[PDB]
């Protein structure tokens, strides 16, 4: 059993969802090192069956400014998928980037 | 040209509880020089009350973004304009106290 903080990790993205920053917490959870994620679109990691829903979720975030993803699966470094939910928020200026708070809902399956 | 920014997490009092190492390039401090101090300790005296009042209100805003601009003392003791965009997060499976997530950008006052 893990405490709430240990199953949450923050990420930052450009508007096309490429990773620009990721908290090191992701490594214990999903296996990736933050530095290997930079420049990869998050969409590379979404299960096929969640892809159409995440595309709609992204459009909602871009239109509204904030979104909650609902449950989806993210591919782990050493195969397997975890269930996650993400709250996304667009940071706008005087859109600049997307801030994601990601919470793991499962073990690697 | 990529704006220079770093992320931090704060308790609702303003104390840094998580600092992204991008802070060294943005303001010149190591994360450990910020962790455990109040962001208000690095704020120009004319802006301190604004920044206090912003932390106080972001928790009333149902998780929406609140922005504030203020002068941040860099490691070189110089005043840099920062635009901090903040919002609260609370994991909905819990009743743990919300905390505040900030993105801190060096910006022009022009």
Task: Name some characteristics of this structure.
heterodimer, A: 109 residues, alpha+beta, Beta-Lactamase, six-stranded antiparallel β-sheet, 3 helices, 6 strands, B: 110 residues, five-stranded antiparallel β-sheet, 2 helices, 15% helix, 34% strand, Endothelial PAS domain-containing protein 1 (chain A), Aryl hydrocarbon receptor nuclear translocator (chain B), transcription, Hif2a, Pas B domain
Write the layout of secondary structure elements.
The complex is a heterodimer of chains A (109) and B (110).
Chain A: E1 8-13, E2 19-22, H1 25-30, H2 34-37, H3 51-64, E3 66-68, E4 72-75, E5 81-91, E6 97-104
Antiparallel strand pairs in A: 1-2, 1-6, 3-5, 4-5, 5-6
Chain B: E1 5-10, E2 16-19, H1 23-27, H2 48-58, E3 66-73, E4 79-89, E5 99-106
Antiparallel strand pairs in B: 1-2, 1-5, 3-4, 4-5
CATH topology name of chain B, in short, is Beta-Lactamase
Shape of chain B: globular
Specify the number of helices of chain A: 3
- Please describe the biggest sheet of chain B, giving its number of strands, its sense, and whether it closes into a barrel: 5 strands, antiparallel
Number of helices of chain B: 2
Helix content of chain A: 10-25%
Elements of chain B, N to C (H/E): EEHHEEE
Number of self-contained structural domains of chain A: 1
By helix and strand content of chain B, what is the structural category?
Answer: alpha+beta
- Terminus-to-terminus distance of chain A: 16 Å
Could you walk me through the main structural features you see in this protein, from its secondary elements to its overall organization?
The complex is a heterodimer of chains A (109) and B (110). Chain A has helices spanning 25-30, 34-37, 51-64, and strands spanning 8-13, 19-22, 66-68, 72-75, 81-91, 97-104. Chain A is of the alpha+beta class and 109 residues long. Chain A has one domain (1-109): Beta-Lactamase. In chain A, strands 1, 2, 3, 4, 5 and 6 form a 6-stranded antiparallel beta sheet that branches. The longest helix of chain A is centred in the middle third of the chain and has 14 residues, at 51-64. Chain A is globular and about 40 Å long. Chain A starts with 7 loop residues before the first strand and ends in a 5-residue tail after the last strand. With 110 residues, chain B is α+β, with helices and mostly antiparallel strands. Chain B has one domain: Beta-Lactamase (2-Layer Sandwich), CATH 3.30.450.20. Helix content of chain B is 15%, strand content 34%. Chain B contains 2 helices and 5 strands. Chain B has helices spanning 23-27, 48-58; strands at residues 5-10, 16-19, 66-73, 79-89, 99-106. Chain B has a 5-stranded antiparallel beta sheet with strand order 2-1-5-4-3.
């Amino acid at each position: 059993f893990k405490g709430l903080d240990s199953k949450t990790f923050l990420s930052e993205h450009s508007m096309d969802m490429k990773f620009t920053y990721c908290d090191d917490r992701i490594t214990e959870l999903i296996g990736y090192h933050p530095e290997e994620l930079l420049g990869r679109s998050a969409y590379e990691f979404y299960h096929a069956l969640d892809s159409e829903n995440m595309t709609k979720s992204h459009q909602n975030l871009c239109t509204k400014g904030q979104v909650v993803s609902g449950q989806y699966r993210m591919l782990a470094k050493h195969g397997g998928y975890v269930w996650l939910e993400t709250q996304g928020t667009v940071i706008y200026n005087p859109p600049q980037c997307i801030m994601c708070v990601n919470y793991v809902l499962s073990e690697i399956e | 040209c990529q704006p220079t920014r770093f992320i931090s997490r704060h308790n609702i009092e303003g104390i840094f509880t998580f600092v992204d190492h991008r802070c060294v390039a943005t303001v010149g401090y190591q994360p450990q020089e910020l962790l455990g101090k109040n962001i208000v300790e690095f704020c120009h005296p004319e802006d301190q009350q604004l920044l206090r009042d912003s932390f106080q209100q972001v928790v009333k805003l149902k998780g929406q973004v609140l922005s504030v601009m203020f002068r941040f003392r860099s490691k070189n003791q110089e005043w840099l304009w920062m635009r901090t965009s903040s919002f609260t997060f609370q994991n909905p499976y819990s009743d743990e106290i919300e905390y505040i997530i900030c993105t801190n950008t060096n910006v022009k006052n022009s």
